[PDB]
Amino acid sequence: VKDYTAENEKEIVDYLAQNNLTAQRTNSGLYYIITKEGSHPTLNSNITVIYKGYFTNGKVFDESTEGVSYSLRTLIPGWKEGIPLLKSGGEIQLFVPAHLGYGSNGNKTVPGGAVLIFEITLVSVN
Amino acid sequence: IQTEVVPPYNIKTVTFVQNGNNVVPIFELNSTFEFQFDDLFGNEANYYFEITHCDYNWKPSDIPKTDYLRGFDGQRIMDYSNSFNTLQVYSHYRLPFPNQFTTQIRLSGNYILKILNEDKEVVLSRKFIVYEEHCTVGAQVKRTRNLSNINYKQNLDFTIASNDITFQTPTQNVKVLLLQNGNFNTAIKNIPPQYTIGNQLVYKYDAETQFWGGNEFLYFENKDIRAANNNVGRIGSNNDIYNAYLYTNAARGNQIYTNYQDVNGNFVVKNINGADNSIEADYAWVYFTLSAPAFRMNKDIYITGIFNNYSLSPEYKMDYNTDKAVFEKAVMIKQGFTNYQYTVADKKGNIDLENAIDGNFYQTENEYTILVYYKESIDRYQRVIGKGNANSINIVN
Amino acid sequence: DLGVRYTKQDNPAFSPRNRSSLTFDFDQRISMSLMGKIGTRLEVNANYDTQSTFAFQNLFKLAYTPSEDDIIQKVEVGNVSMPLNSTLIRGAQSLFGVKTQLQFGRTTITGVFSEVQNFDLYALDYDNDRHFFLSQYFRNKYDVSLKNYPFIDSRVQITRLEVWVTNKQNRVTTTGGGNNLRNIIALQDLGEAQVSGVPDNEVVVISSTAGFFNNPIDSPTSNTNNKYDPATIGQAGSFLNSNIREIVTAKSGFNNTNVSEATDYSVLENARKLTTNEYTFNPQLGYISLQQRLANDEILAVAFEYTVGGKVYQVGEFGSDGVDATVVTGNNSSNQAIITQSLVLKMLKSNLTNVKNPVWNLMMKNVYQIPQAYQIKQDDFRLNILYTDPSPINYITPVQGSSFPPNPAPDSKVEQTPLLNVFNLDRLNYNNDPQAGGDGFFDYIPGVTVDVQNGRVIFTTKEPFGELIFNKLQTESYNDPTTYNANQQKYVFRNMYRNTQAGALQDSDKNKFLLRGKYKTRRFMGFNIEHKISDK
Amino acid sequence: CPVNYVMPPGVQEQALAVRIGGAGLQYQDSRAVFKNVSVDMRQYKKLKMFLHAESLPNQPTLEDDEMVGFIRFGNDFTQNFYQVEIPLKVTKTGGSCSISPDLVWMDDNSIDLALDLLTRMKIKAMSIDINSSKRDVNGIYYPDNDPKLTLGIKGNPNFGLVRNLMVGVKSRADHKDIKGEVWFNELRLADLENKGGMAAILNVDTNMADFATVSATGRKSTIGFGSLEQGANERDREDVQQYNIVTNLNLGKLLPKKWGINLPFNYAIGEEVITPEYDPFNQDIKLDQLIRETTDQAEKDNIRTRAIDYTKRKSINFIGVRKDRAYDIENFTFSQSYNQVERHDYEVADYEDEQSNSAVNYAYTFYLPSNISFNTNILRQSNRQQFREVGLDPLYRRNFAFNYQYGFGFNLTKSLKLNYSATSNNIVRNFFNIWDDYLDIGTPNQHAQQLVLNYDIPINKIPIFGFVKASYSYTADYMWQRSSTAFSEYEDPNGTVYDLGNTIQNSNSNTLTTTLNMNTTSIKNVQINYTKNSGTVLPGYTPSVGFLGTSKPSLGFVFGSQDDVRYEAAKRGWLTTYQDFNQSFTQVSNKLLKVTANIDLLPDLKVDLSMDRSYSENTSEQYSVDPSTNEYKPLSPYTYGMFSISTVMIKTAFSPSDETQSAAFDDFRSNRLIIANRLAEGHYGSGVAIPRYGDANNPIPAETDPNYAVYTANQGYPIGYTKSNQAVLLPAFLAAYTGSDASSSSTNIFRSFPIPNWSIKYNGLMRDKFKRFSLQHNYRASYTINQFRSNFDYNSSPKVQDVNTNFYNEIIMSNVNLVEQFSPLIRMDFELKSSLRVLSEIKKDRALSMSFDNNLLTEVKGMEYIIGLGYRFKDKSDINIKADFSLRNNETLVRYLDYDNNQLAAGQNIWSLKLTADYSFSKNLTAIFYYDHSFSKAVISTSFPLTNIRSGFTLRYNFGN
């Protein structure tokens, strides 16, 4: 049993301060820098993203340099709480905690408990 | 270390049943089989078994037994049934070899099973062979050359043409074992090839590979004990298990061959009135009898078949009865069709096939077996790379 | 013994008279025997038993022994067994009769009175529907890739493969592979993006292909290659409807209103899942080789997952990847709303065997089983393709003026080569390395041209006798015999790879490409004189 | 109506009814009918059948011609055939319509057609009259213009391959649309021809005083010999002239006695000349009818030379050539031989290979190595084959080689046996004569290391550890294939020429078998096994093996040591740089255990245990090396394999499970929320307020939502873990059917600790009336996962939450099994004072098998009750009673989980009561008494419950006693 909630928010704070960025948050614990908006993908629409999932240190663990399409419920919770914000064309990051990401168990390529920074580019919605 | 067989006293009817009926110990590399034997006590004793790889001459090869097995050796025989509803109470033991403990036997070649009894003491031990298939032993009996020893000899000629095992030094590697019916005592072994005309060996001469013909096996079928079936007249029950008296046999060497078929030693444990013949057959003292007035030597006539390993213990030695001038001895034997024969022995182990009390007629129906051992000089044991069976209903003179 | 019986079933189909068959029986058990000699010369011997363990016990031996009058040796009956010292004249060797032996001065006169293999297959009896290409991509790619046998010009690996067949034997045997049987809505276009070769009518069965390919013109098989993508049932534009998860209403779930239950989708309700002992696949070229048979209208649906390098494609929906069996809503037995999904798959057999549709094409009609072969091994297996129009010769002859190709390629060469080097079935030296002409022997690559377990000489083209010879004699369209070279009109046997085996048998005029191989109330009366000229 | 069918005249059955419709036939327009047979009509002399013809009723009357019941047969329908034919004359119908058979199956409409008359017209037309004014229209060549049935041959068809029997009807009326009802009947063959035989089996065997052993043979059979019992279809069809001269010289005795060389010089010649009965071209003709013609003596050379299967061997050899003795001592064994052969047949026209050979052997056999070995031999094959022109290029087929072994043997210490043996196989390539360059060592084609080192693990040396004889073993391997030139210089159609090949293997055998013979509570043995195995395959390995082995990847790699040598190998640069590479790095592994005890608690019983835990992974992966970085890339790996541990689930093994209520299964239906709440704690942190399916933030959709069912059902579970998630219920399945509760048990998938599975066997109850008492008991179980996998979806992508609602699982699987079975539960046999020899087993067994494919487990039952009995007694009245009683039972319940729909799917309730009462009356006449009896109840509604009984006496009378 693990409770990586406060620690992850602390890495969010000191990373988003080292980086001069300033992201807002939610009641669940996300952090994101909305950068644009195409002009809302809800929990029954498809998507088309060009993200890059890299840790807080800088190392990356997954890319989508060519467009992909998910159902937006299959995604992890952080997407579903940040990605419905922007429309088709915009862009956003996500400073996902470990509970809104791959949990405190973690899969391969992601240690159990670690901030997961994404840089999403929602091409289109279906 | 020429480890050899060891005959028991209580245990009787030791065999290697495969696919139902009994067989000779020569087995294929993955063929299943059993070691059904029967203790003559209600004591549900504990018989721990073992297995040992062995060389050509039966010296235990120096392989580690984790290599020619996968499992265990010393673990008591789980499966055994008691003699159900019979006069001679006995415990029928039985063990399949691809069983729980030794889940397979993973190397061809000789072997020796041991049935050491509850401490370490070997009650008995039988030899078998697990032959692998890489050669094509093309054999055929054929009458000899020498006109004197031609009416009572069966030359054996064959080749070994394998297209799988390129022989390195066939004169020194490829040793061969020849078995007359299933017997291991009269094998004509340690024979070098004559020719080696290519990749295939060829054995052709009539000096070594020449078995005595030997007449046909006698039999008796006491399916039901109190019957009067095949040559078992005067069956008498007296304060014991039944007694099956056999008609006095006669020496057949001084006579002409008469077509008289048998199954070459094998017995068939069986009864009428029985569901499972194994645990429901009944032992019965059978009184054998030989009337051989021409036989006069200083050797002992032993009774012999497949039921007793062709053994020569003192519990099968015929006995001259001067009151009738007729050999005779009782031998407890399970029911069913049972073959046998009177084999003279020298005094200890020498059989003296010639001058046998039955005959040596060249035309008798024997089933010769040929096992082709082999040992590359990088291997750690003598393989068995193919057997070729060829019986004498084809004596191609 | 007096036998009683009371055998009776309890099916109500029997009348009131077939109840309790109470037959009797009175089996006789005669078992007589006698023994002993009479007069000191002969020994009577008789033994008859109405059922003996072994047959050879019933005998009536009777032998006279004229003790030392050396003109007769013996006279027997019961079993004769004439002397076996011939190697050529072995006749009556064991049977009832009379045998006598007379011994003059070394002239005994014993008398008697008593009672690897090969194969020849053909271009037409090849192997019925138990060899299927997994998809219409692996079928268009089977000949382009085997241009150089050991090096298969692909990248594919069929990692997981689940095969589903109509559950005809309703049997709950939870021993082989448990009891995992579900529904199926096995489609005929589940995947199969349009290929660069054959037109769309030989790849897709949809009436109008306009609008559902969502990929380039060569992208390999995957759920997402066309808008039957079970990944998206419903949401965006997919033709499926989410009523196409339920077997009860599969028809009203296609959103295009042209589909029929025979030519565009089959439906099963408890289709088995063939355990890994009933099918064997080639996970480099993509074809199932299920060890059973078909043609009793048994649907054959498969969903698999291969990996072209670093990408993982999937051409269906697995058990533990797709919708679960039932989703029941409500606590009460009078309140529940049980729902059963169906696990959309890819069809391969399609009960109504329609030769027009492409699923007929997926049947791999080029795997010829050796008749009653098993574990056929090299060094003892000489395959050879012949052509018995004049006689079983092994090369092709022009039709009085034909020039099969003018200036043939280095390996087409239909001039005088054996048929092996003609059918692209021999190109490898004994070390299995290329060579222009050919080693002169069937190549025997256990993964490409042989199924070593049980026969199945697999040729190295989709339809060898049909279109391999056509192109290799081509100089022009293979899809019509009204434009042939008149050389490729006597050899191109095209009406087999466009029609069944039973049908298209009236065309047994071009069925002359057999292929050899060498895998792995009476009385006797005789006698014999054995004269014994001085020793040796 | 028109003519009543009647059997043919001379027959002791039915017939065709080829019946032309109303439109009629043209002057030459014929219909037909065909089947496929493989008849061999070469032994027989006449093909004779019947025919028949009416006029079709209410149609124009047919005349006695313009109808021919033509037969076709041969290889085909319009290219090869043998038309017999006949002018059918109608039977006179229009009357009683019940004509006798002799007028129905006429003789005028009947065929005999002596077959040897067909070969006549074949000879008259084979290679004659080809496509010029004789072959009438269809190239059929009805014999006319030069010397009953009007025979015909089209393409020189064959006998024996006589397939495609066509039996049609052809009109020959000038201006008429004929319409008939022709019939066909018995199409048998006439008498078959016989012949005599021959033989000669000369043999010669000599011995020139132990020096030469020439043993020759030779046999000259003839056509049709066989034997007595051989009929006229099994005798023989070929003239064979074998003989084999096989000589041993000795060539070491004529050398001086002291030297002791053993040059054997075997020798062997032999050949066959098989002349077939029928020539191997135009099979239906015999050689004689061609060779007994003088058509052309230059063509009689073609014939009687293309029909002889000549083949002679003519071998040489010097196999065993040593010196007797009586390092640094020539104890070799040289050898050399080359065989030959030259074959003719119908079509090979030439054939010969002379497979030369050599040899050499060292085999010395001495802390230093006890043995040494070595041996090479150049296996120089060859071949040639022409073909009959009707001549072609001979297919030069050369095969050469070279190879060798090493072998060491060792006795490094007492109880240590390091072995070793390499090998090789390298291809000579100089292409000519097989006796050309004969010492050249071609490039390596293969190379196989090997190493074996046993070890006794001396632990007896320590004082107290005299009860263990823990052994050990190890057998590394290695192997280097050449990846034939189709790979090595593959050329991308860009033009470039890549290199890719030379795969490599490994292996291991880590065995160690302790025994722990307890002779130092109450235990006598704890025997143990542990046999790991493994092996990789690293295709794309460029470099080679020089000689005497190779340590190129890493010297550990060539002796097992399966650390990843596929990273540095890509770094070193000897790994294939192609980047569309087919083959895939693989691995394997296996494990085992058998921890069998022999616990002995009481003085005469003995219990004993077992422990089994198998395992195997078969991980593989495609890869590719980066050009710039020169680094490795595992492209989409995966794994799969088996599993089985010997568990114990006897806790929930006697509860009721009878298709209406079961305690354990209700626990399993319950645990799927306890474990969902458990293993969501691990996923969602303990400070996260684990989300659900009905809570506020995670609402339930509208009814017309594509996922409305999984939220209405499946109400309060965590968002990731539904009640069908294979981790919410697999550990639930284990916790249920073991008795071990959840909330304290593991949530794992693999369990690395077996459990004994005792086999108690009590015997010491003997301590007087019981002549022998006993007991017994067994127990077996498992957790056999038939196969698992690794989900390609649980990779790294922002994608959890599968198709319905579950989280992707790392280890896919299907059909877990629990196979808890009692062998005889309380079986006790015993024998009273006289005899009451009761025996009674209670076998019993379940087999749970949950299928994660559809989420509905199954089940099985048992309880095959048995009760023997018997009273063998013998005074002299011999009483004998052999009674018993059986029983069986099965079920195959298919229990749904979410709602109670456990519906049975099989079953049996058989029980028998057979018994006998053998009572030998006084001494000779016995009287047995059968009472076989058995129901077979209906467990399902499709069984038809049987019941069948026997009875009856037998009264033997053993006459001669």
- Domains of chain A (count): 1
Q: Determine the structural class of chain A based on helices, strands and strand pairing.
A: alpha+beta
Helix content of chain B: under 10%
How much strand of chain A? 15-25%
Structural class of chain B: mainly beta
Helical fraction of chain A equals: 10-25%
- How would the global form of chain A be characterised? globular
Q: Give the terminus-to-terminus CA distance of chain A.
A: 39 Å
Largest beta-sheet characterization of chain A: 2 strands, antiparallel
- Report the β-strand fraction of chain B as a percent range: 25-35%
Q: Alpha-carbon distance between the termini of chain B?
A: 41 Å
Which oligomerization state do the chains in this entry correspond to? part of a larger assembly
- The spatial strand order of the largest sheet of chain A comes to 1-2
Tally of contiguous helical segments of chain A: 2
**What's the shape of chain B?**
globular
Number of DSSP strand runs of chain A? 6
Protein name (chain C): Protein involved in gliding motility SprA
Catalytic activity (chain A): [protein]-peptidylproline (omega=180) = [protein]-peptidylproline (omega=0)
Keywords (chain A): Isomerase, Rotamase
Organism (chain A): Flavobacterium johnsoniae (strain ATCC 17061 / DSM 2064 / JCM 8514 / BCRC 14874 / CCUG 350202 / NBRC 14942 / NCIMB 11054 / UW101)
Describe, in short, the structure shown.
The structure is cut from a larger assembly and holds one copy of chain A (126 residues), one copy of chain B (397 residues) and two copies of chain C. With 397 residues, chain B is mainly beta. Helices cover 2% and strands 28% of the residues of chain B.
SSE topology sketch:
The structure is cut from a larger assembly and holds one copy of chain A (126 residues), one copy of chain B (397 residues) and two copies of chain C.
Chain A: H1 6-18, E1 24-25, E2 31-32, E3 52-54, E4 60-63, H2 77-82, E5 92-96, E6 116-120
Antiparallel strand pairs in A: 1-2, 3-4, 5-6
Chain B: E1 26-28, E2 37-39, E3 50-54, E4 80-82, E5 91-93, E6 109-114, E7 125-131, E8 137-142, E9 153-160, H1 170-173, E10 176-179, E11 201-203, E12 210-212, E13 218-220, E14 235-236, E15 243-245, E16 249-250, H2 277-280, E17 284-291, E18 300-304, E19 319-321, E20 326-333, E21 338-345, E22 367-374, E23 383-387, E24 390-391
Chain C: E1 3-4, E2 24-25, E3 31-38, E4 42-49, E5 59-63, E6 74-77, E7 97-101, E8 107-108, E9 111-114, E10 132-133, H1 142-145, E11 158-165, E12 182-184, E13 268-273, E14 287-288, E15 300-308, E16 311-314, E17 346-347, H2 358-361, E18 367-368, E19 384-385, H3 419-422, E20 457-458, H4 464-473, E21 515-516, E22 524-527, E23 530-531
Antiparallel strand pairs in C: 1-2, 3-4, 4-5, 6-7, 7-9, 8-23, 9-22, 10-14, 11-13, 11-15, 12-13, 15-16, 15-17, 18-20, 19-21
